[PDB]
Symmetry: D2
Subunit: 252 residues, 4 copies
């Protein structure tokens, strides 16, 4: 039977490109989403029209809280309920906004919980449930960030979250290797910029990229995910592949 | 007059060595602690006997919660209320225990303790530190990281994530606070003082792995690096993390 | 027509797997070799049998010397002479032996072999590659996942491989505006040396988290292939470890 | 008796600050130099005037060649011959100039950039260690905070410095059992010459988060002194950046 993947925040942009390419490759997918219900359900309908009963949606807030463990356990469960298995987990869902150390109107506790939750704690709880329920080509891939060591100004909690994700990637690769589960990452630099991003705001970041002076397409990021879930990456674990067009190599 | 430092989890071991060496260099210290009240107060007594009105304690749980911002603000406030200033912050307090992904604390609690103490508390401490400064000294922060974060212990995933996060704060905060004159750096031990309840056989197993001396670092050795980072000899150093590991991270499996 | 690749030290083991997998995907290959002439020609014969006029050999010492630039120029030239083009360069050739700091080769020779093959040849090859330029041009450098946790007494090897990391980054940066991508593949324990004891091979194997076994040469070639493919067209400056978790294990 | 250090390229700028600062802490210094004879001798004079018989000069080209091993052995010998001991070695001498991949020859570009930044440091380390085979022995290597985000067209330089990182780790590992520590100090922008363009110097200074300015040579030397000091007795294989946050700034 066909394998199954969970992709978090999979309704739009890069998560969608991931889920669609996995689907194109023959996976059944669970499309996790948070606020993007229309796009999530429109996407699962598109994929089910191509192959009946191959896409399902699952809503969940991945903000850290007393209930996050249960939410993540449920996301994994949806995959098993629908498809009877879970072969792959893509941690793509991520909050990203500035959190100045020195003075949007959220509280710091809410900043902490949204940035560290989505980027690190949820990934960890998802990995925990993924692993527990494995009772093959099993693997996890985490959406990281090529610029963690040269981070954006005032994005300390985001950056802290992505660095945590790299440590989860290494820690989880180490511990789950004996269960046959590989754990790896893909680290974009500038990929899709918000549709909002005034077309010349984009170019300020686009002009910085040595390979092409353009952002990555979502499909280019997904290509790396697909490679890491594939049988061509069977020996690869604990690895994080940057797909940044050289941007992290560019000095100030 | 004399500058002041906040040292978290300062009641024993490495934190204590840091607070003692900073005191010996002329700092007034706030000795934060969580459960170690008798050691915290015994230490402040010793330092105030050496120089009156130079050491104060501050109890606070740094587990993550909706009140942790408030606790961290208070820690900083206790330094200003005692000493009228806060010149350095050492983020040393840290929970450390295994959190297996698979095969009595709840995971919510495992998360809140390991991520709180190792990362979120340091972030919040740093925010309160920075907000309380003026907008005229050698202001800096030092974070106690971990040399082994890229080759971590088996089943310590939450701890490791906390330390990696600390690394990212170090960088992020160095970048953001450099314009305020506030340097931010790290010291990354390997094996320093060891558990109370591990056998000499297991302590010897870790010791044998250290290329420089086949021995763990003394707490004073770690403190030496902190002192360097706070000193005027490191005034251009920010965003840097100094490993003090006797080569242990260079040893392959 | 078909693209062409240069693969250094391609006569056996990992370089052979790279050149065969490249050939299997439709590339014409230059099989560079140094001492392994019988295996080089035997491989080019096997590939030309499968597809006539698709494999050629090229002998060259990649020890550092004042003629090394010329050797590396010739390697690239062989590719253009045979196939009219050069689309891919795989820097696989490498010397590897201990060079203790507290000690039959002289140190001048240890330096020239370990630094030349693992770093300066690669640099010179990439220069020649670049100067000689629809397409998907890229370079893949064979690095080593253990550079930060190196073997005892292999300082010149390790320096070579760390230098290869730097070329990777520096070349990626500089050649990106010419459309040329530059990336690496960093094995841990892959094929073991035939002169190793089976007992000492097993000791390294038992260290690998993922399978307690060394990588096959094919498994390394897979990652090279990915990097040269159209699926990696935004990837440059990147080095992919293929080590089964070996570098994440503490002492 | 006072300890002795060798500092390479010590006639001017950062090497000079290192030597001066070591001298100020009670070391006898061997001031190595290449072309800067008048500054080397003028410095040794100043230091000897302060404390008689505590500074000596030693000329050597550190470009890679057949004779580099010998030259590096002599540099170490000059310290033993003058002072009867050698306790620290600072590898500061370095060539730095562009080497585009697309008036010197490439063979000479290779020998100067890789020799000064890497191979000489290795050979010095080898001689240092062999001559040893209370006491605080260490080596400190001048690295470069920007090796992972290198300057455009400085391939060979960057390869050199990455190599130096590798030697640092490899030597730390191998020499730790002899009690010899090996560490590095990684500047970002420190002294920029007043001959370099005010616009281009301003671009660089404006990029530094901490102060919008270059490090003084003395600030770099401070980090060297820390690492040689008894306050760094457990530190080995570590490289300390002294870059004012410059390497944390994205493009
Ligand atoms: N685009 C880039 O240049 C770039 C660069 C570096 C790294 N990355 C990484 O690549 C990934 C994908 O990037 P993207 O730009 O496609 O991401 P994005 O659009 O900003 O976010 C992806 C998804 O995250 C979900 N999300 C946000 N908050 C959530 C919450 N509290 N709970 C559950 N889900 C939540 C959203 O779901 P809903 O809309 O359904 O609410 C969203 O569709 C992320 O991991 C990101 O950090 C991207
Ligand atoms: N020892 C080592 O080999 C080693 C190795 C690598 C890195 N490090 C790093 O070096 C630092 C110091 O190490 P160490 O061994 O001295 O540390 P430790 O003894 O394990 O912990 C130091 C203190 O942290 C405080 N702490 C724990 N949980 C807390 C909480 N929830 N709220 C507030 N405080 C809490 C405790 O204070 P109370 O006792 O008062 O409760 C404890 O005494 C740590 O940052 C560590 O991660 C140490
Ligand atoms: N095998 C591993 O576990 C492993 C681990 C980490 C990294 N790697 C890296 O992966 C790549 C291939 O590894 P491998 O194990 O296949 O390597 P290998 O067999 O040791 O080397 C491949 C070829 O290197 C060539 N070579 C050696 N000295 C040369 C010289 N002076 N001039 C020109 N060519 C020379 C040889 O060519 P000839 O026989 O024709 O003379 C040899 O067949 C290398 O870059 C290696 O450093 C391998
Ligand atoms: N200044 C900076 O912003 C900066 C930034 C990053 C890293 N660094 C690193 O820090 C160190 C000191 O830098 P700096 O700028 O003071 O250095 P520098 O002026 O460029 O060079 C230092 C000395 O190296 C010696 N040297 C050059 N070529 C040589 C050769 N072929 N043989 C022997 N010696 C040779 C020269 O000595 P003679 O004058 O006697 O010929 C020179 O005075 C270097 O390791 C450097 O790469 C500096
Ligand atoms: N790094 C990152 N992380 C998230 N979650 N979202 C985004 N969106 C980018 C601004 C387009 N980027
Ligand atoms: N917080 C922390 N971090 C590490 N690595 N080790 C320790 N060890 C102490 C015995 C508890 N504590
Ligand atoms: N060139 C190279 N590099 C490594 N790491 N390993 C090997 N193994 C070959 C059998 C010696 N070769
Ligand atoms: N990185 C480096 N290395 C050397 N030797 N010299 C320099 N000089 C810079 C122009 C001040 N930079």
């Amino acid at each position: 039977e066909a394998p199954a993947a969970v992709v978090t925040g999979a309704a739009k942009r890069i998560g969608r490109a991931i889920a669609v390419k996995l689907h194109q490759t023959g996976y059944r997918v669970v499309i996790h989403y948070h606020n993007s219900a229309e796009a999530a359900v429109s996407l699962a309908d598109e994929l089910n029209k191509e192959r009946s009963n191959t896409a399902v949606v699952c809503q969940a807030d991945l903000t850290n809280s007393n209930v996050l463990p249960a939410s993540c356990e449920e996301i994994i469960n949806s995959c098993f309920r629908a498809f009877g298995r879970c072969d792959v987990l893509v941690n793509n869902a991520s909050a990203f906004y500035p959190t100045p150390l020195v003075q949007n109107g959220k509280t710091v506790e809410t900043q902490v919980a949204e940035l560290i939750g989505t980027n690190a704690i949820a990934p960890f709880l998802l990995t925990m449930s993924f692993a527990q329920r494995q009772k093959s080509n099993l693997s996890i891939v985490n959406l990281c960030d090529a610029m963690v060591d040269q981070p954006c100004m005032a994005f300390s909690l985001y950056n802290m979250g992505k660095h945590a994700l790299v440590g989860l990637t290494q820690s989880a690769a180490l511990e789950l290797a004996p269960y046959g589960i590989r754990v790896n990452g893909v680290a974009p630099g500038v990929s899709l910029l918000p549709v909002a991003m005034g077309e010349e705001e984009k170019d300020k970041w686009r002009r910085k990229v040595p390979l092409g002076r353009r952002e990555a397409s979502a499909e280019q990021i997904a290509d790396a995910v697909i490679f890491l879930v594939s049988g061509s990456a069977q020996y690869i674990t604990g690895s994080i592949i940057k797909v940044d067009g050289g941007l992290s190599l560019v000095h100030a």
